[PDB]
Amino acid sequence: LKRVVWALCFMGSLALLALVCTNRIQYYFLYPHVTKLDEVAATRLTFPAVTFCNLNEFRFSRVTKNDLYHAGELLALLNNRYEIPDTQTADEKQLEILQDKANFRNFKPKPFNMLEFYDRAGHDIREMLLSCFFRGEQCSPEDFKVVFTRYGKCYTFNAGQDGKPRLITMKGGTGNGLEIMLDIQQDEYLPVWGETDETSFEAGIKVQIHSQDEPPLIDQLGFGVAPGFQTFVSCQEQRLIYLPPPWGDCKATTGDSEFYDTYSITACRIDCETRYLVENCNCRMVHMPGDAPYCTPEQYKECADPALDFLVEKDNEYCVCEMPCNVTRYGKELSMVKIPSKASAKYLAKKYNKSEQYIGENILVLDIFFEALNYETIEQKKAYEVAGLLGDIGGQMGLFIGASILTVLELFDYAYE
Amino acid sequence: LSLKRVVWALCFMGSLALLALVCTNRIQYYFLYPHVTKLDEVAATRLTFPAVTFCNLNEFRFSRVTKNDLYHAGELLALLNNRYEIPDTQTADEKQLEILQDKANFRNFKPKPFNMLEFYDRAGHDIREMLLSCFFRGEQCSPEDFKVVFTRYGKCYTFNAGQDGKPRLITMKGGTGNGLEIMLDIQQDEYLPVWGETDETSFEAGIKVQIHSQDEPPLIDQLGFGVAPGFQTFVSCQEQRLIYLPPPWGDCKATTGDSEFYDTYSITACRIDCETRYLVENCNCRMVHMPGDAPYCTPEQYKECADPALDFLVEKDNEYCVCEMPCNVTRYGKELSMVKIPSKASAKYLAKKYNKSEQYIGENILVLDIFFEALNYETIEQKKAYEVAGLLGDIGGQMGLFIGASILTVLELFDYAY
Amino acid sequence: LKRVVWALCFMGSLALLALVCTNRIQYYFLYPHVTKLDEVAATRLTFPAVTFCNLNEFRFSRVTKNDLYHAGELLALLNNRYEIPDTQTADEKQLEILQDKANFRNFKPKPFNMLEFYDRAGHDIREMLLSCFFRGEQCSPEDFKVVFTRYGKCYTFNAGQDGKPRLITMKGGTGNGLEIMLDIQQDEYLPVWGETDETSFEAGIKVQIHSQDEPPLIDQLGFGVAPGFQTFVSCQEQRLIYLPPPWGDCKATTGDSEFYDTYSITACRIDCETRYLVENCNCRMVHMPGDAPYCTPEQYKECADPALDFLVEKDNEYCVCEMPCNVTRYGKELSMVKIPSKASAKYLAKKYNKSEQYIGENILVLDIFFEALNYETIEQKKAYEVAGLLGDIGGQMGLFIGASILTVLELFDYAYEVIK
Ligand SMILES: OC[C@H]1O[C@H](O[C@H]2[C@H](O)[C@@H](O)[C@@H](O)O[C@@H]2CO)[C@H](O)[C@@H](O)[C@@H]1O
Ligand SMILES: OC[C@H]1O[C@H](O[C@H]2[C@H](O)[C@@H](O)[C@@H](O)O[C@@H]2CO)[C@H](O)[C@@H](O)[C@@H]1O
Ligand SMILES: OC[C@H]1O[C@H](O[C@H]2[C@H](O)[C@@H](O)[C@@H](O)O[C@@H]2CO)[C@H](O)[C@@H](O)[C@@H]1O
Ligand SMILES: *[C@@H]1O[C@H](CO)[C@@H](O)[C@H](O)[C@H]1NC(C)=O
Ligand SMILES: *[C@@H]1O[C@H](CO)[C@@H](O)[C@H](O)[C@H]1NC(C)=O
Numbered sequence A: 001l002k003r004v005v006w007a008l009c010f011m012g013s014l015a016l017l018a019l020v021c022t023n024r025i026q027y028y029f030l031y032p033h034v035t036k037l038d039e040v041a042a043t044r045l046t047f048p049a050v051t052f053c054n055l056n057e058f059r060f061s062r063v064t065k066n067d068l069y070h071a072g073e074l075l076a077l078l079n080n081r082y083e084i085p086d087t088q089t090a091d092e093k094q095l096e097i098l099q100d101k102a103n104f105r106n107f108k109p110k111p112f113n114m115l116e117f118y119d120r121a122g123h124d125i126r127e128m129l130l131s132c133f134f135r136g137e138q139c140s141p142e143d144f145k146v147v148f149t150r151y152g153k154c155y156t157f158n159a160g161q162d163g164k165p166r167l168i169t170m171k172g173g174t175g176n177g178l179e180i181m182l183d184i185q186q187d188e189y190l191p192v193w194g195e196t197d198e199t200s201f202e203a204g205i206k207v208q209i210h211s212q213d214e215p216p217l218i219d220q221l222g223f224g225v226a227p228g229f230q231t232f233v234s235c236q237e238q239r240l241i242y243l244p245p246p247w248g249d250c251k252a253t254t255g256d257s258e259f260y261d262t263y264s265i266t267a268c269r270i271d272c273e274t275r276y277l278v279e280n281c282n283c284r285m286v287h288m289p290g291d292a293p294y295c296t297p298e299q300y301k302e303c304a305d306p307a308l309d310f311l312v313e314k315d316n317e318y319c320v321c322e323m324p325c326n327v328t329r330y331g332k333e334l335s336m337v338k339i340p341s342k343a344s345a346k347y348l349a350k351k352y353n354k355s356e357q358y359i360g361e362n363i364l365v366l367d368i369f370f371e372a373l374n375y376e377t378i379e380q381k382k383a384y385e386v387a388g389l390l391g392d393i394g395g396q397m398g399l400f401i402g403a404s405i406l407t408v409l410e411l412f413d414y415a416y417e
Numbered sequence B: 001l002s003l004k005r006v007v008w009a010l011c012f013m014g015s016l017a018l019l020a021l022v023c024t025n026r027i028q029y030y031f032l033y034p035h036v037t038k039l040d041e042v043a044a045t046r047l048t049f050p051a052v053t054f055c056n057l058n059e060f061r062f063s064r065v066t067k068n069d070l071y072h073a074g075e076l077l078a079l080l081n082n083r084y085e086i087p088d089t090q091t092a093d094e095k096q097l098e099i100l101q102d103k104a105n106f107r108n109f110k111p112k113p114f115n116m117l118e119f120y121d122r123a124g125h126d127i128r129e130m131l132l133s134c135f136f137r138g139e140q141c142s143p144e145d146f147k148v149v150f151t152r153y154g155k156c157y158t159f160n161a162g163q164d165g166k167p168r169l170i171t172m173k174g175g176t177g178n179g180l181e182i183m184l185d186i187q188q189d190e191y192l193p194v195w196g197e198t199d200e201t202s203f204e205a206g207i208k209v210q211i212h213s214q215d216e217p218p219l220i221d222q223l224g225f226g227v228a229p230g231f232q233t234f235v236s237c238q239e240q241r242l243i244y245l246p247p248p249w250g251d252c253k254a255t256t257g258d259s260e261f262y263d264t265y266s267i268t269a270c271r272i273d274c275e276t277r278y279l280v281e282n283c284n285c286r287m288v289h290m291p292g293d294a295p296y297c298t299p300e301q302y303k304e305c306a307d308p309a310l311d312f313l314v315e316k317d318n319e320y321c322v323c324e325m326p327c328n329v330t331r332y333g334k335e336l337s338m339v340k341i342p343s344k345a346s347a348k349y350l351a352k353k354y355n356k357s358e359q360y361i362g363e364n365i366l367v368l369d370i371f372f373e374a375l376n377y378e379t380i381e382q383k384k385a386y387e388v389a390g391l392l393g394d395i396g397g398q399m400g401l402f403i404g405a406s407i408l409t410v411l412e413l414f415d416y417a418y
Numbered sequence C: 001l002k003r004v005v006w007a008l009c010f011m012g013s014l015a016l017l018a019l020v021c022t023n024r025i026q027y028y029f030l031y032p033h034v035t036k037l038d039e040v041a042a043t044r045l046t047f048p049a050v051t052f053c054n055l056n057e058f059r060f061s062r063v064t065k066n067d068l069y070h071a072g073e074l075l076a077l078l079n080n081r082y083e084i085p086d087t088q089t090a091d092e093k094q095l096e097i098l099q100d101k102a103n104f105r106n107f108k109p110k111p112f113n114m115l116e117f118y119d120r121a122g123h124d125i126r127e128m129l130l131s132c133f134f135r136g137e138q139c140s141p142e143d144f145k146v147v148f149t150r151y152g153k154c155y156t157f158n159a160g161q162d163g164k165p166r167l168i169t170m171k172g173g174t175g176n177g178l179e180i181m182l183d184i185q186q187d188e189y190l191p192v193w194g195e196t197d198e199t200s201f202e203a204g205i206k207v208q209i210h211s212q213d214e215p216p217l218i219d220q221l222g223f224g225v226a227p228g229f230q231t232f233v234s235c236q237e238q239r240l241i242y243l244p245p246p247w248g249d250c251k252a253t254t255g256d257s258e259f260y261d262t263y264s265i266t267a268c269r270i271d272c273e274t275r276y277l278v279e280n281c282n283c284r285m286v287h288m289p290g291d292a293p294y295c296t297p298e299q300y301k302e303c304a305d306p307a308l309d310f311l312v313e314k315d316n317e318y319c320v321c322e323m324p325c326n327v328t329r330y331g332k333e334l335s336m337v338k339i340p341s342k343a344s345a346k347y348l349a350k351k352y353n354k355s356e357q358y359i360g361e362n363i364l365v366l367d368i369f370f371e372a373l374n375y376e377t378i379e380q381k382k383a384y385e386v387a388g389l390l391g392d393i394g395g396q397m398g399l400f401i402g403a404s405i406l407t408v409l410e411l412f413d414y415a416y417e418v419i420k
């Protein structure tokens, strides 16, 4: 007889497949994601780059008559008339020497450049670094790469480019980390007679721990370290991965570097800051990339400093960056003990040829290492991929192919006639 | 060749048992009301800057303590053993004992009305005197940007309380520039001499600070962090928004549970509310920093009932004042660091600017920077892992597999069974 | 033969089903995991153990002529000739007493033991502890357990297994925690005339907050606390649970307790370090477990310190520890204020019978407590278990079987072709 039951079942089988495909395909277009977390003790962890700056930008003994003439006003050492202000806070022979230095009678100005000034007058790592050790191995001034920041001449440990085939840490604790003893040299601090962006009321250093493929932004993001203490910095590397649209909203540039090889929030901000200053001040500050001419002291005071301050303080629209797809964050827990103890003050004073009082106001020890659970990952993952879609329809699709197959083994003869 | 009949018969049966087991196991799972906690850490824009409350560790300014104050609160502050003997304890500042011995002479003195709130409000440190400089995102702030708030430390101040005005302060980029920077003078010259150990006296110098959501009251004596004079302290933060699910899936309490003294539910609001009811019931008074309208405890009540009662609650209590988890919580992760102030090179400038000795600057001035790091926003939210719609979808998919498999049977066992 | 359009149906049929099953089965064999996170305010949270050490290892007043003879060089107080270098080095007050104590004229060395020296000369909790309060209740020296570490004689508050009820925290804040005031006693600090693993340029204490079943490794993992400040340590307990193979690479506390009842990274490191030193120096440092003989001060300087330093600084393969399946981490946020204020110095000086100057250079207060959200859990869970696999492809691998039988039962009757 006539069995419509077969044509009805075939339709159903196709109908069920249509619904499953529509449902699963709709969910797929929602491009959902899941964030996977894990916190473990990784081995062979790559030690980061560590940048540090003295809070004092220019060494008093390195400031010359010509430097004073050109940048004196910027440093608040001279008034708008090339003269020492009514601010004479130096009952010492520091004012005396400064007045001789400020004597411009018959003085002939010589060429001046801010970058050269920072490079020449900035604190010298060779003098600041009293000792340096990384995982039991002694490091020297040469292990530090010079990098210019808003603080001027700063230094980066393990910047990555030398030999030492990637520095790594294996265990938790100070032993597997970096330990440095520094002399901040307050005797070389520039007298502070006013408040300016280059002026500092504080003594110590600013530090920033960051990935080697990310430039520092130490004036904004660094942490402080005070003289007279041994500071312990226990860290945890946190690797965050994000997804680009339609899943997420991150971004990731390719090899080609407008200024920086890798994309990061800092690289983006510095890039944007530089273009903003070049456009508005027709010059770049000494710590900025590119080839525009460096700003003169006058431009720093009249345009550059106020322009950058606007960007890092008030701006809400000019330099806003998009999330990178790859970010490395370093969680840190800081603590400190006093240096020197009464029992070691004499030993340190003699060793470095300083008074005991000096040691207590200038020496600092900094330990940067990782805790046992040194590695955490937070990665956005695609929740419903193709393999997941096909798998979700494969089951129902099979039953349909089967019905069609059984339809073939049922009409093979009739069809063949 | 009859086996080809039982095969499609067993398959159908099996396909039936599978539909049953899977569906039953998924409805049971549903009734376990499971949850998933979703985590995401990003760099948010237009982040709302939190409220920042701070208190001087010294509760009463020496120069503002009068004869009447000493008469009423001298015992509480450990400055007097009784009202008939003259103080004789040497003070760091020699002139303080002399002034104290004169203020302590009550012979022929007529006591005037006294109030602890009035005393705190009048003798507590003045923000207009402590605040040397204040800047938020490049803009200069002033004492008026600070709202007076009473805590267990007495008269304290909150920056960006969000009580008055309207202009919501926002942060956009990571770093000190997008944050708050304040320079304070803690005024140790105004610190009351410490001659005994009480809950109102302190061995320390500096301030206590608490960064909190604007809709959450502070609990600074318990949860604040310290900031020391002689340093510039950097506080790099990260906002963490946590969302919890109610009783079925979780065990939180809607931040709208019959608002008592506060309109938003938080652990702190709950603790303060509970503490207040405890004190009003057991002491018949409330401390100056507590809400409500109960009478304010007198100095006598502070010493005899209030301090002991509040200490019991924040230290020993395990049952009286316990709070349920709120469904909405905002935590601020913080990383602190510091550098020294002043440098030898700036000490003279600061001394001259504020007419103080260089030594004074070194023991009283501090600078505090509160800002956010690049990845300023983290979210940790509990979500229902299996809702009804999800259960239906799964059941619908299972039936789809059932019908699909059974069709092969009806089609191969048609001629036979029918 | 047009029989292929019949042989393909069975093969194609078993193809799809096989594909659908292999998909989830291959996934199952990857043994995927999911990490569940939660952060809450737990009630009756178990307070951790808190270990602390003075940065100075030996009290000047407790050093004897015989201690000086045996440990002098190790402490840099004597040169390799048993003599005190150029007098112009330290306080003449201490120099004199030290010169007298160093006078070895026809002196006969008596037996010496480093453990005994640390125990006798190390700082005494009875002297360092000025006050101690836990949740409003006074604690005392008897509340601290002695524990030897590389810093020498240290102390642990709430070590546990002390026959007392478990200490618990219920609310956030300083009130529900520990507060201790210590005197670091710089007047007892050994003069420093050189740099050795046993000398310190710093003054203060080292502290380590840890679970009671985990030994301390304070020289490597502790945090510092400075004199002249009240330090606040706001904590959050974080419980991490990991899965063993094939899901993960963690190892649980199985077998016997070679040295410790529970497994932890620190227990593993201390065990390994001990074995390493016994092998290379045939002795163990005072803070190590076991029964090997204690290294002499000469062995410390010539073999032990260099050996341990190698392990904690340079080694990359000798002591590699596996991940525990259970870990408790304590996140912490530190802050501080100054002590004493100008207004409280006299009171403290009088109360503890010390000069005002002494108070400012030796006293410190430490507060260890938990924030409101005191408990975080991060646990690895199995993502795809057998029941889940069967729930996904139970029907497919079921039909595949039937199709297979139906197939074997097919080409079988096909064997009929043999006749012809
Ligand atoms: O990659 C995500 C995807 O993984 C698994 O699919 C695997 C499959 O199990 C393997 O046998 C092989 O075919 O590679 C596939 C991925 O390309 C999961 O089964 C699937 O749900 C998931 O989406
Ligand atoms: O049938 C095999 C197939 O079962 C599951 O796919 C389900 C899906 O998860 C449901 O949401 C709904 O769409 O029904 C589908 C089955 O028809 C497994 O998730 C999938 O991996 C498996 O291949
Ligand atoms: O019982 C906890 C368990 O429930 C669910 O696993 C189910 C599965 O979904 C069903 O299809 C069937 O196989 O029974 C299983 C339980 O025995 C959840 O999917 C699973 O995550 C959860 O642990
Ligand atoms: C993220 O960048 C780091 C280098 O900083 C690299 O090692 C890692 O593989 C990257 N992750 C991904 C998947 O892009
Ligand atoms: C030590 O410092 C003094 C004073 O500045 C100086 O005269 C002397 O040359 C220095 N000694 C050495 C060896 O550098």
Ligand SMILES: *[C@@H]1O[C@H](CO)[C@@H](O)[C@H](O)[C@H]1NC(C)=O
Pocket: B243, B255, B256, B327, B328
């Ligand atoms: C509680 O959390 C929900 C979910 O984000 C939010 O919409 C609400 O504003 C929060 N608090 C309330 C009830 O206002």
Ligand SMILES: *[C@@H]1O[C@H](CO)[C@@H](O)[C@H](O)[C@H]1NC(C)=O
Pocket: B355
């Ligand atoms: C502030 O300095 C002035 C002189 O510049 C002095 O007369 C005055 O007494 C000082 N302020 C006080 C009262 O401490």
Ligand SMILES: *[C@@H]1O[C@H](CO)[C@@H](O)[C@H](O)[C@H]1NC(C)=O
Pocket: C211, C213, C241, C326, C327, C328
């Ligand atoms: C983890 O270890 C602790 C002991 O430190 C124990 O109390 C707890 O029950 C353990 N948790 C699990 C899931 O094993």
Ligand SMILES: *[C@@H]1O[C@H](CO)[C@@H](O)[C@H](O)[C@H]1NC(C)=O
Pocket: C353
């Ligand atoms: C106080 O210290 C002095 C000098 O160190 C000592 O002689 C005296 O015994 C101490 N007082 C008491 C009662 O301990």
Ligand SMILES: [Cl-]
Pocket: A269, A273, A311, A312, A319, B173
């Ligand atoms: Cl910017």
Ligand SMILES: [Cl-]
Pocket: B271, B275, B313, B314, B321, C171
């Ligand atoms: Cl309470």
Ligand SMILES: [Cl-]
Pocket: A171, C269, C273, C311, C312, C319
């Ligand atoms: Cl080791």
